[PDB]
Every structure is written in structure tokens, then in C-alpha cells.
């Protein structure tokens, strides 16, 4: 076990700073999971709203309970981001002034769901945020062609050397069942010298890559973020905190490029020494921030 048994908002205090709750504004957070920062911004806005939404039920259900004495301020939805603008009108709500993205897995993705989300432990290859959908971990690994799974584990593993070597060991593997099998696979992949260079566990970004592919996590991000600004009123802020560096070079250049956003952050704001240490899930952690002009 390496994440904490508590789960804990990811730089609380630089969401609350960039996204500025006060008065009453309506507050947009894009991946509410187990309700970590809506709760933070509900303590520290009286007279605020929050749209908390996201795909996975599960954690809806806590995000709902930890949420119990905010409930006549803050409403949950199941829906992705993606159609976030529409479950706003269907709300009779057009524009918000704050939206809120945290790009990682919760607490309780990562240790109580036993959906192999990491490898802690013996568990099944699932790594669906939403059970619904009908692509799982284990029919990835086993079914795509080799070479589309080494496209995945370089572009969103960031495997930049090993990617085709990992690609061949999983094939190498089928079928694959549980994480332990997963982690064989990229063992078997990467030299001796290599696991023990790494700072971070060897399968960590092999993990990523299958789960960001499972969840369309790359193509939400960005389609979403071709938009989001029409969702903001006059004066309003979009802060993304991201655990990935292509997710973050995504946040950055949109905010950038777009002619309707100030970036606020030109760069990226990262989490205390302590933080990190104290809350594993803040590991990798850039928050972006924007404001609609
Ligand atoms: N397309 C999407 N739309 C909405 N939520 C999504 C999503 N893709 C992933 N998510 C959710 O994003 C969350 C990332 S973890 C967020 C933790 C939350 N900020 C807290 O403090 O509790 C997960 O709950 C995941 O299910």
C-alpha cells in the first residue's frame, strides 16, 4: 500500500485561491469524485452553488453522504464532463462562474473498488471509472493488436524506449486476469538496471497508459477544453489540475491559444514538499488556471 487510507483534495488551497468562491457564484466541478474539493469550497463560500458531476457512481455515493450538510447548495449528476453543457441547461443554468478539473483517480477508485485501477494488489484488469461502459482493462490487453498497444503505452504511458518491449511482453502474457499479471508483463519488459533506476514503481506508467485509454480520459480532456470557455461568464475562472505531462501541455496551449482566456498560471503550480509526501495522489500534480475575458 503506498496511496493514504484518507482521502485528501489535491492543493485545496491553490483551487480555492485561483478559482476565487465567494458571493454566490455557481461552481462547475467536472469530476467531483468523492466531493474533496466541493466540500472545501462549500466551507469556505457560504453563499455559493455546486454542479458536482461525474461517471462513476460509486464514488457519487460518497461524494454524496460527505457532502450531507451542503446538500441544499450542491446537486450530483452522473455525466461525463463532455455533456456537461447540456445537464447545465437542462438546470436552466447557461454559464457558470467557476469550473474545476482534477484529471487523477480517487482514493476509493484506487483501494476499494477492486478494479485493478493499480497494483497494490491482486486485483481484476477492469479500470472502468464508469461500469457501464463495456471496455475493460482485460479485453484491452488481450484482444488490440500489439502494435496499437504500443502506440498506447508510448503516448499515454509515456513509455518514450520501452513502449514496443512492454507492447510484446503483455502479448507475450495472454491472457492476462488479474494486476499481478500486468506487472509481470512490463518486470519482464524492462532490465534489472532500469527497475531500479526508476523513482516511481516500474509499471506505474504502463497502468496509466491502459486506464487513460479505457476512460478516453485524453480525447474528453480535450474536446471538452475546445469549449469550456462558452460555459464561463464574464470574469469567471477554469482551473485544471492534471497528472500528466501531454494532459498538462493540452490545459496549457488551450488556455493559450484560446482569444476568450487570460491564463493566469504560465506556470504550472505544483504541490508543496509536504504535500506529496503526505498525499501520494498529489504525486505528478500541475494545476493550470484561466480567466474568461
Ligand atoms: N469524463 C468524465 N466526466 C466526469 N468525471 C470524470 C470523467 N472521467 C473521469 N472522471 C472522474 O474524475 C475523477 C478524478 S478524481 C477527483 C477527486 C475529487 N476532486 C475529490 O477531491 O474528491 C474520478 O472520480 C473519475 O471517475
Redesign the pocket.
Known sequence: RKYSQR?I?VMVREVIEFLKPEDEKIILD????????SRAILEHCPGCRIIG????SE?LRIAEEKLKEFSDRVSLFKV???EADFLLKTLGIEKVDGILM?????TY?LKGENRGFTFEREEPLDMR?DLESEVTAQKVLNELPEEELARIIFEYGEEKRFARRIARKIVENRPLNTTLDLVKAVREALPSYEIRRRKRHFATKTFQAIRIYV?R?LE?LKEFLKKAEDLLNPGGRIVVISFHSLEDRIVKETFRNSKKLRILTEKPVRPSEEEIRENPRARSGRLRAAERI
Open positions: 482521502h483534495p467536472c469530476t467531483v469524485g468523492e466531493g474533496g474539493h458531476i461525474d461517471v462513476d464514488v461525463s464532463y463532455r482534477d484529471l487523477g483517480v480517487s477508485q471509472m476512460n480520459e474528453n
